[PDB]
Amino acid sequence: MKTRKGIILAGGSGTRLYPVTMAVSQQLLPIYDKPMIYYPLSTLMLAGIRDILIISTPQDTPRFQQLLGDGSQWGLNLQYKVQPSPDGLAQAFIIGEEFIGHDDCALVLGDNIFYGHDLPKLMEAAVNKESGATVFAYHVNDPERYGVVEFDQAGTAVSLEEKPLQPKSNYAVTGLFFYDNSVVEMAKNLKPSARGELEITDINRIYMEQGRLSVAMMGRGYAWLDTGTHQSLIEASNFIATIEERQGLKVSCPEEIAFRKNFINAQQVIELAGPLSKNDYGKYLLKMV
Amino acid sequence: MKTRKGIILAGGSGTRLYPVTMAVSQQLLPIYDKPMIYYPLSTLMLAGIRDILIISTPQDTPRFQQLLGDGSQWGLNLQYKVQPSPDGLAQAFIIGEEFIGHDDCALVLGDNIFYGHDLPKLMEAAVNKESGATVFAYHVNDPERYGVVEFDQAGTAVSLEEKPLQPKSNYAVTGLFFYDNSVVEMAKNLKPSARGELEITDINRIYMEQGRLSVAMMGRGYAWLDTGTHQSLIEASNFIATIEERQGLKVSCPEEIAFRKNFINAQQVIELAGPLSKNDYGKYLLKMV
Amino acid sequence: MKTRKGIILAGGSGTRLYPVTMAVSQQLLPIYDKPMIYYPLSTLMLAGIRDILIISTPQDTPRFQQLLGDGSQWGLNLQYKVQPSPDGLAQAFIIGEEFIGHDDCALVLGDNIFYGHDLPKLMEAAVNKESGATVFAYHVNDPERYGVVEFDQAGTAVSLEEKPLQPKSNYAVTGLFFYDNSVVEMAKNLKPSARGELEITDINRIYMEQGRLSVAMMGRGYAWLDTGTHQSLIEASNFIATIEERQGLKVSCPEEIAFRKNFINAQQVIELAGPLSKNDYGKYLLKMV
Amino acid sequence: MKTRKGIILAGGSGTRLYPVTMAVSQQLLPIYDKPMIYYPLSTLMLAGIRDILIISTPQDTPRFQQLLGDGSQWGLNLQYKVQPSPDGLAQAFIIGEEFIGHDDCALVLGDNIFYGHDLPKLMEAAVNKESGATVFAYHVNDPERYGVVEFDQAGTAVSLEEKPLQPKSNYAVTGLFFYDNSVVEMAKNLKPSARGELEITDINRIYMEQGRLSVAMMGRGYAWLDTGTHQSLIEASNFIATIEERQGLKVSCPEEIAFRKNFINAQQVIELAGPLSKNDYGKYLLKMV
């Protein structure tokens, strides 16, 4: 089956970004011209995923809802589920078991920002994988900061270590994940780690250990914009701004993606743009049609 | 009577920034490493003002209160009041009458950032004017946008015009305002302008027609950033970040303002830094004391 | 045949970038960590092209030689020709006639900065195209600044206009081109245009009339860093930096490409890195091997 | 007497910035919209100094002359001398001994960028000091790297140390020194230090041990950018860029300084602007008069 459901893990308090996030949820902070959640949500839309569950902290969930709704406007089917406390990625599958049912499900952090060429192609194998899982590896300067995927001499992936003190490779596990229906049970049988969290790395290690973990390599031609500090945040906004302004196009603009992927027709775009004739975002949607 | 009372009109829908303001108050968005509101708040602090009224919309008013509280943490006394609808900056005095009372009151916009080493020396005067009011003019390329103030060959002021179609100067009146008790009654008498608003410029002009209006100039060392559009929003954040990383310091840091001005002591700083100690913002305060 | 000859047109007085280009030539301006010319050269290399002809101004040409030499160090055959005057892009073929010979040759401007995933596959068709020519279309915000390609209802490129007043599309022709042997005589027969230049558009036109012009589409996932203004040079620099500093990888590092594509081996890397062992770039090299 | 002479030391192999400096002198590199050297040179001009000697490497000195000429175009008197090898700052005076004669002379490093409104007012005292020296201190989190000056509980130049392992304070001595005429004789007497050089901190000690050393403190309203590495260079570049487009003013623009201090008139400005008009640099000056 084609992975047609996804979950956006937009929780966390964002203590890392205080006092900024103290006022507004990180996934809501604007990345140049749109709230962060738009980027990873766009990534799901690029994979053909319409049925998406957005999980946010009890405080922010109503906020996101205010911004996206049932996503009906963009041919999407948005649903919301609250996560009482940030206890690890893997819990997203528990927090949304009922949502997944017996279908394959992709997962993506709400602060996972991607930019690059064949993004859909890149996710194609992951979206069409019958059983198993797919994670995406990216070359970073600070491997220890992420889950590192080790590589032998042949090439394929042979292991996965979460924030190792001595990374076996410079490739990190990005915030985009794809699992089959079996992730739910894994998550439910998973035990917390030292930092008391249900580590997605444990779930990935389980797939790999069964020879069912595909690691999609992401070359230096793709950009995985970090959003862990105030610095990276502006560098991310400028990056995206640099690209959009030069292109006259937007990156990760859900309305457009919805429109170009035929989730909504031209009339639908106008109805959405109509009220927003002020800001440039509206004029952009209008011009796009 | 030193002006010991200031009002921050941080309301309005700020739609010009959609969708980054759909579920987030414009005044809550960040400027690099802190929320926007943090800036105009520090501005009043630098003026020695500690009794501040935070005006805003019913939806957003409680939010700032959530992030800011009463201000006691920063030796301040924050008070909030709701504005049923954006009827003009001047309504800030009608809505904050009980607040002002008989005392001189300052009004600073919740979305206006003010940078400038000597900016404090400059306000000190405004806070010491016995009667009348004081405005701060800044040289901008888009005079037509803001409010403009004309100056004779003697450098003195002569006329004020709200968004002149044909500007008589490049010096626009920033959202920093220092008034005396006569302002409250001035607002009450004001009639709705063309755009059905109580223009703050009508107040200012009145003082001028009475020679009770000073105009502090913001030389080549000042900076009055805009925050109406996405570009200006990131542009402003880029400024703060740049200057903050280079000149080694924090711009409009309420904590630093509080400690540096004896509003709070060293110990109280280390206490505020804690929830903030995962990034520079907090680690800075820790190193300051 | 496979296009194995390249011409990097790094001429120009750079008047537009004064006084920056008054001191150093544009193509030598640093794009963060390496000189500009290094990016296009890297593009040619990634295309497999090792025999290159650098065409620069009488004044700058030598600066490039001191910088690159015969290129033998990177397994490249770098030759130099002097363009007395910027008579046009097409002139790059007249100056490199003897260089081109009966072989196909690619053209790349010294300020053409390309970044994105799969740069080689994007150019593969061009490299192997038996005959004809291949250019690239990229959606930009200011088409009138470039040669605009027009597409019919089916989406097939059918027209090409140079800096038109009313762009028939938003897709501009990039600074990377691939032509067959017939480009030389084609160019040698071009007459000056309004701006008295041997327009590369005319050349491409000829190929298109004949149906020998492939217009490869360069998607929004690639970045075509602008280098027209000081503002775009710094953004281009920031862009490149945000990518490198995140992956711990360099974008457009000749030594690396040379080493990766086997143009040179590990030992040669040591020798090339030897003298620079006292600097970041040199460390990047050693760390590579 | 007022210090009317100054030396801009602009030598060095620049190997730190390879390969951007391989074919370009570091001091010729751009800092956003103008050549680096335009900064230190602007510092001197703001200090009233008009007669300046530019010392560079034998190969590089020419490129500076080709760029600045005799400097008469800006009302300056530019003279050039050569430094066969980088034996130290102090050597500048042995080189420029014939240029200095019997007058006080200032020194500025070619690659030093100073920013600050009060900068002129500050240097004023340095130029008017009857005898002695005037160094400039700035707060740097990386003292060990530079020359560090010590301040007793009172706040004076109690101790000077060149790149001390154990910084005796976080105040570094910038690259702008104002000496009296006795410095020349000091230089010629200095002896090679550990790194076989003629240390400037040594010459500075002499003045200190004579109670003749003044220390101009550069508060937080100042910014002394670094340009030693690729990262620093781009940072320094984002700095200037942001303050100009934000504050609407060019930073360290010789033409403007020349016109502001009446070294040149508007007629000359327009003529200078001509070649530079193809961009804001020209337009600015044209608009400035």
Ligand SMILES: O=c1ccn([C@@H]2O[C@H](COP(=O)(O)OP(=O)(O)O[C@H]3O[C@H](CO)[C@@H](O)[C@H](O)[C@H]3O)[C@@H](O)[C@H]2O)c(=O)[nH]1
């Ligand atoms: O219960 C939770 C846990 C996390 N988060 C959010 O998830 C995002 C993930 O960021 P972060 O917490 O810093 O990721 P880590 O937990 O440090 O690591 C996981 O996410 C990384 C993605 O960069 C992977 O590299 C690692 O292998 C994986 O273990 C953040 O915005 C978090 O607030 C939630 O919303 N709820």
Ligand SMILES: O=c1ccn([C@@H]2O[C@H](COP(=O)(O)OP(=O)(O)O[C@H]3O[C@H](CO)[C@@H](O)[C@H](O)[C@H]3O)[C@@H](O)[C@H]2O)c(=O)[nH]1
């Ligand atoms: O009742 C109101 C009206 C406005 N605003 C806020 O004020 C900010 C300023 O923007 P805007 O309302 O469009 O400014 P203007 O009201 O058009 O102009 C006023 O504010 C300018 C400063 O930008 C001054 O230059 C002008 O002289 C002054 O008349 C915004 O975030 C608004 O939401 C409120 O909070 N409440």
Ligand SMILES: O=c1ccn([C@@H]2O[C@H](COP(=O)(O)OP(=O)(O)O[C@H]3O[C@H](CO)[C@@H](O)[C@H](O)[C@H]3O)[C@@H](O)[C@H]2O)c(=O)[nH]1
């Ligand atoms: O009068 C001139 C002409 C060219 N050059 C040099 O030649 C190269 C060309 O740059 P530029 O003048 O800006 O390109 P255009 O001539 O305006 O346009 C050509 O290059 C564009 C971008 O690659 C294409 O879109 C167009 O179709 C093609 O005609 C550069 O290195 C320039 O410095 C000059 O210095 N002066």
Ligand SMILES: O=c1ccn([C@@H]2O[C@H](COP(=O)(O)OP(=O)(O)O[C@H]3O[C@H](CO)[C@@H](O)[C@H](O)[C@H]3O)[C@@H](O)[C@H]2O)c(=O)[nH]1
């Ligand atoms: O004979 C020489 C020595 C240096 N330089 C140049 O001076 C600049 C300054 O950098 P560097 O040589 O590394 O400065 P240091 O020698 O490390 O230190 C000196 O310059 C510092 C400011 O950067 C001061 O704080 C110190 O007290 C002073 O001793 C560079 O572009 C050098 O190439 C020359 O041109 N000629």
